[PDB]
Ligand binder design. Structure first.
Ligand SMILES: [Mg+2]
Ligand SMILES: [Mg+2]
Ligand SMILES: [Mg+2]
Ligand SMILES: [Mg+2]
Ligand SMILES: [Mg+2]
Ligand SMILES: [Mg+2]
Ligand SMILES: [Mg+2]
Ligand SMILES: [Mg+2]
Ligand SMILES: [Mg+2]
Ligand SMILES: [Mg+2]
Ligand SMILES: [Mg+2]
Ligand SMILES: [Mg+2]
Ligand SMILES: [Mg+2]
Ligand SMILES: [Mg+2]
Ligand SMILES: [Mg+2]
Ligand SMILES: [Mg+2]
Ligand SMILES: [Mg+2]
Ligand SMILES: [Mg+2]
Ligand SMILES: [Mg+2]
Ligand SMILES: [Mg+2]
Ligand SMILES: [Mg+2]
Ligand SMILES: [Mg+2]
Ligand SMILES: [Mg+2]
Ligand SMILES: [Mg+2]
Ligand SMILES: [Mg+2]
Ligand SMILES: [Mg+2]
Ligand SMILES: [Mg+2]
Ligand SMILES: [Mg+2]
Ligand SMILES: [Mg+2]
Ligand SMILES: [Mg+2]
Ligand SMILES: [Mg+2]
Ligand SMILES: [Mg+2]
Ligand SMILES: [Mg+2]
Ligand SMILES: [Mg+2]
Ligand SMILES: [Mg+2]
Ligand SMILES: [Mg+2]
Ligand SMILES: [Mg+2]
Ligand SMILES: [Mg+2]
Ligand SMILES: [Mg+2]
Ligand SMILES: [Mg+2]
Ligand SMILES: [Mg+2]
Ligand SMILES: [Mg+2]
Ligand SMILES: [Mg+2]
Ligand SMILES: [Mg+2]
Ligand SMILES: [Mg+2]
Ligand SMILES: [Mg+2]
Ligand SMILES: [Mg+2]
Ligand SMILES: [Mg+2]
Ligand SMILES: [Mg+2]
Ligand SMILES: [Mg+2]
Ligand SMILES: [Mg+2]
Ligand SMILES: [Mg+2]
Ligand SMILES: [Mg+2]
Ligand SMILES: [Mg+2]
Ligand SMILES: [Mg+2]
Ligand SMILES: [Mg+2]
Ligand SMILES: [Mg+2]
Ligand SMILES: [Mg+2]
Ligand SMILES: [Mg+2]
Ligand SMILES: [Mg+2]
Ligand SMILES: [Mg+2]
Ligand SMILES: [Mg+2]
Ligand SMILES: [Mg+2]
Ligand SMILES: [Mg+2]
Ligand SMILES: [Mg+2]
Ligand SMILES: [Mg+2]
Ligand SMILES: [Mg+2]
Ligand SMILES: [Mg+2]
Ligand SMILES: [Mg+2]
Ligand SMILES: [Mg+2]
Ligand SMILES: [Mg+2]
Ligand SMILES: [Mg+2]
Ligand SMILES: [Mg+2]
Ligand SMILES: [Mg+2]
Ligand SMILES: [Mg+2]
Ligand SMILES: [Mg+2]
Ligand SMILES: [Mg+2]
Ligand SMILES: [Mg+2]
Ligand SMILES: [Mg+2]
Ligand SMILES: [Mg+2]
Ligand SMILES: [Mg+2]
Ligand SMILES: [Mg+2]
Ligand SMILES: [Mg+2]
Ligand SMILES: [Mg+2]
Ligand SMILES: [Mg+2]
Ligand SMILES: [Mg+2]
Ligand SMILES: [Mg+2]
Ligand SMILES: [Mg+2]
Ligand SMILES: [Mg+2]
Ligand SMILES: [Mg+2]
Ligand SMILES: [Mg+2]
Ligand SMILES: [Mg+2]
Ligand SMILES: [Mg+2]
Ligand SMILES: [Mg+2]
Ligand SMILES: [Mg+2]
Ligand SMILES: [Mg+2]
Ligand SMILES: [Mg+2]
Ligand SMILES: [Mg+2]
Ligand SMILES: [Mg+2]
Ligand SMILES: [Mg+2]
Ligand SMILES: [Mg+2]
Ligand SMILES: [Mg+2]
Ligand SMILES: [Mg+2]
Ligand SMILES: [Mg+2]
Ligand SMILES: [Mg+2]
Ligand SMILES: [Mg+2]
Ligand SMILES: [Mg+2]
Ligand SMILES: [Mg+2]
Ligand SMILES: [Mg+2]
Ligand SMILES: [Mg+2]
Ligand SMILES: [Mg+2]
Ligand SMILES: [Mg+2]
Ligand SMILES: [Mg+2]
Ligand SMILES: [Mg+2]
Ligand SMILES: [Mg+2]
Ligand SMILES: [Mg+2]
Ligand SMILES: [Mg+2]
Ligand SMILES: [Mg+2]
Ligand SMILES: [Mg+2]
Ligand SMILES: [Mg+2]
Ligand SMILES: [Mg+2]
Ligand SMILES: [Mg+2]
Ligand SMILES: [Mg+2]
Ligand SMILES: [Mg+2]
Ligand SMILES: [Mg+2]
Ligand SMILES: [Mg+2]
Ligand SMILES: [Mg+2]
Ligand SMILES: [Mg+2]
Ligand SMILES: [Mg+2]
Ligand SMILES: [Mg+2]
Ligand SMILES: [Mg+2]
Ligand SMILES: [Zn+2]
Lengths: 83, 99, 138, 208, 124, 99
RNA sequence: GGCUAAUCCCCCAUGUGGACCCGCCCCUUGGGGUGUGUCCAAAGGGCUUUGCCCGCUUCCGGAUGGGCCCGCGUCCCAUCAGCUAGUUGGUGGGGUAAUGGCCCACCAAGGCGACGACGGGUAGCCGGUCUGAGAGGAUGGCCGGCCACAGGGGCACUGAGACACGGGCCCCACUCCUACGGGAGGCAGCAGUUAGGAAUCUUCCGCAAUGGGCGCAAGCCUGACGGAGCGACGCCGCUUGGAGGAAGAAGCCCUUCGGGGUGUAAACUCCUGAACCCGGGACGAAACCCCCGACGAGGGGACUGACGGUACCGGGGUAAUAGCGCCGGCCAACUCCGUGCCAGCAGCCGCGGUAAUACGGAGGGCGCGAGCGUUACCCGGAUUCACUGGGCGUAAAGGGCGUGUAGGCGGCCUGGGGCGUCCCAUGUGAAAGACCACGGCUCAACCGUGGGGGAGCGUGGGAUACGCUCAGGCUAGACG
RNA sequence: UUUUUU
RNA sequence: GGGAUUGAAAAUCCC
């Protein structure tokens, strides 16, 4: 089952994530299908979250499955906002 | 010690017996049907070949033959019967095969 | 038989200039004639002309040299200091348009044979085509 | 930890006045006064014609010892400049002159380089309002290098800024003397520096 | 060689042979001494150079030079082998590390103490 | 694209199969000159059409046997034994250079 | 031996539909449609119990992951030259998801090799990394991708997937239990022990974060992971003070006995304040969940730390580790005494046999500095395997000579083709790295965001000078 | 015969 | 093992 989740790319005590589409069976930091954004949890920069919604909306159409965290971020960039 | 994935091996052997036996009947009926075709008896070969087909497609319902593996045997069976029935043909029952 | 007629011609010119011949004949071929045209255009020779020698065509090449020099060895400077065949038989040398070399930091030429014709490097880079690299001349 | 030891001895071995001592390299005591010969037992002996290497070596030391840097940071700085676009020679200088510790000296907040080093290391120096206690920190063009108001009442700072009234500052620097502020306007040019150093000799030192 | 010749046979990379068969190409190797000798050197010099035969953990038996002014090395002491030859004795390719298991460092050595394996003294 | 090659038939002697010899030209990666290698492909000929000396196109196909992954696309040119005798003579030279 | 439940197993039914034989139609390898005939479906549970949630069945498609096939590339030895019996192909069959000598029966007698077969040696491969002006050489640790293995060897079962590290069977070696009949094991998982070795760590904390498994969920499991510990092992930042201070103390060192040197260095005067103490004290954490709204969008609200009372901020505040190598030339830095071919140094050339800047110590100097030296190995200098970029009269090197096989190479003119070669477009060239730019840790190392490049190969389009090829002609080469 | 050519 | 001997050694010669 292909999934939308976070991969860790920071350094020790400096985490930086890549919101990422990959098969749930690969390592969390290993090869992935597409990079669909990034996440800085410590909010060190004015832009610590980006998505490219229209691409995230694609992978949900074909049945990717976001983590509880990935979804919490996708909702922040309004992938699911429908008005 | 004593991980209870041993339960998995237990069930393994049960399924072994189920699959094993289903296939035994497939083989025993196919050979029976081909024999009658080779011996010219057209009605009896068809009546049997139908059960073989039914037994085959039924084994595909479970995890025994699941794939196109079922179609192989069905294909090879119907082929051999109709050909072996090409010796004083007269395909009496005509049930299984096509006009 | 002659082995590489072009290097042969390049050498006829090379050997003739070192003794300051006024002219030199090379056996006539159209391809050779197209090399001689680039040199004549580029100012390395006065020029060439077709001519017969015992029935068979040849090409007189009219070399040029500098002014007579001062004390010992008055012999003039050469116009062709260096001529060297690059792509020979038995090892052929082709270059793409980006692989075309800068000869003597621009003060020389490199005669390319391209699908658009025998060109100098500058003309070939401007025409945007590569090809077989015939020789450096500087 | 950088070189810590006698200094007006290095004034001597280079044969040029080195101003690492701050004051008294101005007063007639620098020992470049009435002792310009190198240190040691063989100082007064007639020197042998230096090797082509010996020249290039003494020239880098002339430069490195001026800024009070370990060869490590010094060599890294140089290999940095040979990569950046522009003259490897001058760019190198602009990077040493961008060191905070040197900037503090150039701005006359401290008497010497070494004293400016201690002022930074002890947090007395502000960069754009924040404290910076790293001497190696590189100053950007435009940054405000001030004195932390905690130390603005300190007698060593009021001492050095007292003598700074009316003294002129570098064409790439400017300072407010009362509020103890200061600004790094732009990188300095080769011409801007009066350093008695031939950079081309230093580039040639690292060619080998 | 014609280009064709290079296409047919080509150049041959030169294989460099090792000057130190301290096997596994290790940086050091430890061994046990067999003899402790003193050997006369090659032509232009003369002295009594102290050496030792050593059975190695590599399975080899080789001579080794004992550096320094004096040594405590005996017939049965165990030692560490360094590598690097002694020019003026033939067939001596490896040195001995002083300050290792049973080869004491050189006493009263005050200049080059990393080599010769001696500690730092006190000054009153 | 299924790879397409063009070579010459050098072996008739199998059943429903021909040996096609496919030459190749390229610059040497270091020494540059244009060098000429050539590899033999076992091509499938179901109708036994093609013969010795025929220059044929060959096309990457679904495996027919071991060693057989190409079929004969079309006949480019028929009957040039000069190409075959170049290969025959070469193979025949191998009987020296042993002992 | 006996009883029993089910989302366990089976039979009948319904045939959306799919499977199979045959026919036909379109496509073109076994792709898609169609007709007749035959064969094939299922399982329930939960509640806010009239409706909804979790599931079940057959089929079409998507997505992701993978099997198999092909072109090209992929180390050394020719003192390995001939190898091959399922071996090469064929017909039919078995097998599998599927092609295939994958296996089988029968037929034909083939297949491979100097363009290196067969044999031997060595070795996981790549992204990359080190080096180098480059071309190249070397390498494949960490991180990322593919592969193979799980004490050695073989085999299957279960399953969507395995021929399965912590699953099963058998043979072998080894350890443990053994009532001697027979059994149990399998750290190349994390730590840890032991052996070998020059040498490589904690039987640590945690489920708080990210990710994975099961579950409606609550939650459970996770030595993946996130953190801490030890080791200057690497990199980076940082301290061992700063300013004043004698034409210049003592000591030590040299001396022409005048003096010179260590050296503003110390002492001493003033200032700052690494350590350490005190107070405060994190980001990493917002969802899952609950409530509103329809269990959607959206809004609202609540719990949740290993690191850790650590980072960091504020207050107080002490002058507070320096070492190691070298000083004959290459190569930066020199004098005295000691020793007399001794003791010793030595990377090479060489020093030492009574004045040694080369041994040993001292004084001094040079170089780096929490490091500095050494040994091993790799590239470099080495244009010393020479593609870039070398050579063979006497320096290493022309085969004793001919004949000629393969191969390499090919005069002048025209035309066709467009294989090499060149141009355009396009796909591919994962990420990380490298490069440029900006940004986040006070800087940096480290990390983040964005940008550009790229040989190679696929595909489409084009050019035709040169090389290739086919057709024609010439006579200067060659032959008669 | 051995080192050292000053 | 100390003297002659040599720049110093080997050798040779002397207690
Ligand atoms: Mg996977
Ligand atoms: Mg993005
Ligand atoms: Mg935002
Ligand atoms: Mg956004
Ligand atoms: Mg989770
Ligand atoms: Mg949507
Ligand atoms: Mg709306
Ligand atoms: Mg068990
Ligand atoms: Mg279970
Ligand atoms: Mg039976
Ligand atoms: Mg039935
Ligand atoms: Mg199965
Ligand atoms: Mg060339
Ligand atoms: Mg190209
Ligand atoms: Mg160029
Ligand atoms: Mg070039
Ligand atoms: Mg253009
Ligand atoms: Mg530069
Ligand atoms: Mg530039
Ligand atoms: Mg100033
Ligand atoms: Mg300026
Ligand atoms: Mg360099
Ligand atoms: Mg090759
Ligand atoms: Mg060849
Ligand atoms: Mg070779
Ligand atoms: Mg070895
Ligand atoms: Mg051995
Ligand atoms: Mg051994
Ligand atoms: Mg050595
Ligand atoms: Mg061909
Ligand atoms: Mg045939
Ligand atoms: Mg090749
Ligand atoms: Mg190569
Ligand atoms: Mg090349
Ligand atoms: Mg066909
Ligand atoms: Mg066609
Ligand atoms: Mg051929
Ligand atoms: Mg029972
Ligand atoms: Mg029972
Ligand atoms: Mg039914
Ligand atoms: Mg229907
Ligand atoms: Mg038919
Ligand atoms: Mg029907
Ligand atoms: Mg069921
Ligand atoms: Mg219900
Ligand atoms: Mg109900
Ligand atoms: Mg109920
Ligand atoms: Mg697919
Ligand atoms: Mg696929
Ligand atoms: Mg080898
Ligand atoms: Mg074979
Ligand atoms: Mg065999
Ligand atoms: Mg056999
Ligand atoms: Mg078959
Ligand atoms: Mg299977
Ligand atoms: Mg089949
Ligand atoms: Mg047959
Ligand atoms: Mg081949
Ligand atoms: Mg061949
Ligand atoms: Mg082998
Ligand atoms: Mg191996
Ligand atoms: Mg580089
Ligand atoms: Mg390589
Ligand atoms: Mg390798
Ligand atoms: Mg390689
Ligand atoms: Mg390799
Ligand atoms: Mg590891
Ligand atoms: Mg890496
Ligand atoms: Mg990591
Ligand atoms: Mg790896
Ligand atoms: Mg692969
Ligand atoms: Mg195995
Ligand atoms: Mg095994
Ligand atoms: Mg399953
Ligand atoms: Mg496996
Ligand atoms: Mg396996
Ligand atoms: Mg295990
Ligand atoms: Mg077990
Ligand atoms: Mg068992
Ligand atoms: Mg051993
Ligand atoms: Mg041990
Ligand atoms: Mg660890
Ligand atoms: Mg679930
Ligand atoms: Mg509930
Ligand atoms: Mg547990
Ligand atoms: Mg970890
Ligand atoms: Mg450091
Ligand atoms: Mg001082
Ligand atoms: Mg304070
Ligand atoms: Mg938090
Ligand atoms: Mg928060
Ligand atoms: Mg939770
Ligand atoms: Mg409600
Ligand atoms: Mg919400
Ligand atoms: Mg404080
Ligand atoms: Mg002090
Ligand atoms: Mg010198
Ligand atoms: Mg020494
Ligand atoms: Mg004496
Ligand atoms: Mg003396
Ligand atoms: Mg002497
Ligand atoms: Mg000395
Ligand atoms: Mg000495
Ligand atoms: Mg000293
Ligand atoms: Mg080191
Ligand atoms: Mg080397
Ligand atoms: Mg080289
Ligand atoms: Mg050599
Ligand atoms: Mg060459
Ligand atoms: Mg050149
Ligand atoms: Mg040479
Ligand atoms: Mg020759
Ligand atoms: Mg001779
Ligand atoms: Mg001869
Ligand atoms: Mg001949
Ligand atoms: Mg020939
Ligand atoms: Mg030609
Ligand atoms: Mg030809
Ligand atoms: Mg044409
Ligand atoms: Mg045509
Ligand atoms: Mg073309
Ligand atoms: Mg491209
Ligand atoms: Mg990349
Ligand atoms: Mg590089
Ligand atoms: Mg910054
Ligand atoms: Mg590109
Ligand atoms: Mg194309
Ligand atoms: Mg005639
Ligand atoms: Mg004649
Ligand atoms: Mg005599
Ligand atoms: Mg001499
Ligand atoms: Zn001074």
């Amino acid at each position: 089952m292909v999934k939308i989740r976070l991969a860790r790319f920071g350094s020790k005590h400096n985490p930086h994530y890549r919101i990422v589409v990959t098969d749930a069976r690969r390592k969390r930091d290993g090869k992935y299908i597409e990079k669909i954004g990034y996440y800085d949890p410590r909010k060190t920069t004015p832009d610590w979250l980006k998505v490219d919604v229209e691409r995230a909306r694609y992978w949900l159409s074909v049945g990717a499955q976001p983590t509880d965290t990935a979804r919490r971020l996708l909702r922040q960039a309004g992938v699911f906002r429908q008005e | 010690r004593n991980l209870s994935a041993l339960k998995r091996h237990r069930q393994s052997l049960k399924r072994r017996l189920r699959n094993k036996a289903k296939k035994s009947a497939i083989k025993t009926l196919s050979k029976k049907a081909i024999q009658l075709a080779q011996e010219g008896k057209a009605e009896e070969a068809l009546k049997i070949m139908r059960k073989a087909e039914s037994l085959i497609d039924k084994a595909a319902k479970g995890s025994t033959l699941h794939k196109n593996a079922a179609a192989r045997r069905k294909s090879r069976l119907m082929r051999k019967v109709r050909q072996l029935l090409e010796a004083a043909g007269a395909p009496l029952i005509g049930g299984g095969l096509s006009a | 038989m002659l082995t590489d007629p072009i290097a042969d011609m390049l050498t006829r010119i090379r050997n003739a200039t070192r003794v300051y011949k006024e002219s030199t004949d090379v056996p006539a071929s159209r391809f050779k004639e197209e090399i001689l045209r680039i040199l004549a255009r580029e100012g390395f020779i006065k020029g060439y002309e077709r001519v017969d020698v015992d029935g068979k065509p040849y090409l007189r090449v009219y070399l040029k040299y500098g002014p007579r020099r001062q004390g010992p060895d008055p012999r003039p400077e050469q116009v062709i200091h260096h001529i060297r065949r690059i792509s020979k038989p038995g090892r052929r040398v082709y270059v793409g348009v980006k692989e075309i070399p800068r000869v003597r930091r621009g003060l020389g030429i490199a005669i390319l044979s391209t699908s658009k014709g025998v060109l100098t490097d500058r003309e070939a880079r401007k025409l945007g085509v590569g090809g077989e690299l015939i020789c450096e001349v500087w | 930890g950088r070189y810590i030891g006698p200094v007006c001895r290095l004034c001597r071995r280079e044969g040029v006045k080195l101003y690492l001592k701050g004051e008294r390299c101005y007063s007639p005591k620098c020992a470049m006064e009435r002792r310009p010969y190198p240190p040691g037992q063989h100082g007064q002996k007639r020197a042998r014609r230096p090797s082509d290497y010996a020249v290039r070596l003494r020239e880098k030391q002339k430069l490195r010892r001026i800024y009070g840097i370990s060869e490590r940071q010094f060599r890294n700085l140089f290999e940095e400049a040979s990569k950046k676009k522009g003259v490897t020679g001058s760019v190198f200088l602009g990077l040493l002159e961008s060191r905070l510790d040197n900037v503090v000296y150039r701005l006359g907040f401290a008497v010497s380089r070494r004293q400016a080093r201690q002022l930074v290391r002890h947090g007395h120096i502000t960069v754009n309002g924040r404290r910076v206690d790293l001497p190696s920190y590189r100053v950007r063009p435009g940054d405000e290098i001030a004195v932390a108001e905690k130390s603005r009442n300190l007698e060593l700072i009021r001492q050095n800024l007292e003598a700074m009234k009316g003294r002129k500052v570098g064409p790439w620097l400017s300072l407010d003397v009362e509020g103890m502020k200061g600004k790094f306007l732009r990188l300095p040019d080769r011409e801007d520096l009066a350093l008695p150093v031939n950079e081309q000799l230093v580039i040639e030192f690292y060619s080998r | 060689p014609t280009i064709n010749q290079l296409v047919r046979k080509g150049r041959e990379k030169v294989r460099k042979k090792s000057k130190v068969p301290a096997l596994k190409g290790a940086p050091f190797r430890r061994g046990v001494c067999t003899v402790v000798r003193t050997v006369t050197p090659k032509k232009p010099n003369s002295a009594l150079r102290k050496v030792a035969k050593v059975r190695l953990t590599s399975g080899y038996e080789v001579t080794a030079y004992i550096p320094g002014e004096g040594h405590n090395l005996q017939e049965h002491s165990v030692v560490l082998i360094r590598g690097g030859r002694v020019k003026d004795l033939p067939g001596v390719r490896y040195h001995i590390v002083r300050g290792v298991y049973d080869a004491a460092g050189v006493k009263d050595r005050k200049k080059s103490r990393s080599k010769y394996g001696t500690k730092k003294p006190k000054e009153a | 694209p299924k790879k397409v090659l063009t070579g010459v038939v050098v072996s008739d002697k199998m059943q429903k199969t021909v040996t096609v010899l496919v030459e190749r030209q390229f610059p040497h990666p270091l020494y540059g000159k244009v060098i000429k290698r050539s590899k033999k492909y076992l091509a499938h000929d179901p109708e036994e059409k093609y013969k010795l000396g025929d220059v044929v196109e060959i096309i990457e196909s679904r495996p027919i046997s071991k060693r057989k992954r190409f079929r004969v696309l079309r006949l480019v040119e028929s009957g040039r034994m000069d190409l075959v005798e170049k290969y025959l003579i070469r193979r025949q030279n191998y009987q020296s250079l042993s002992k």
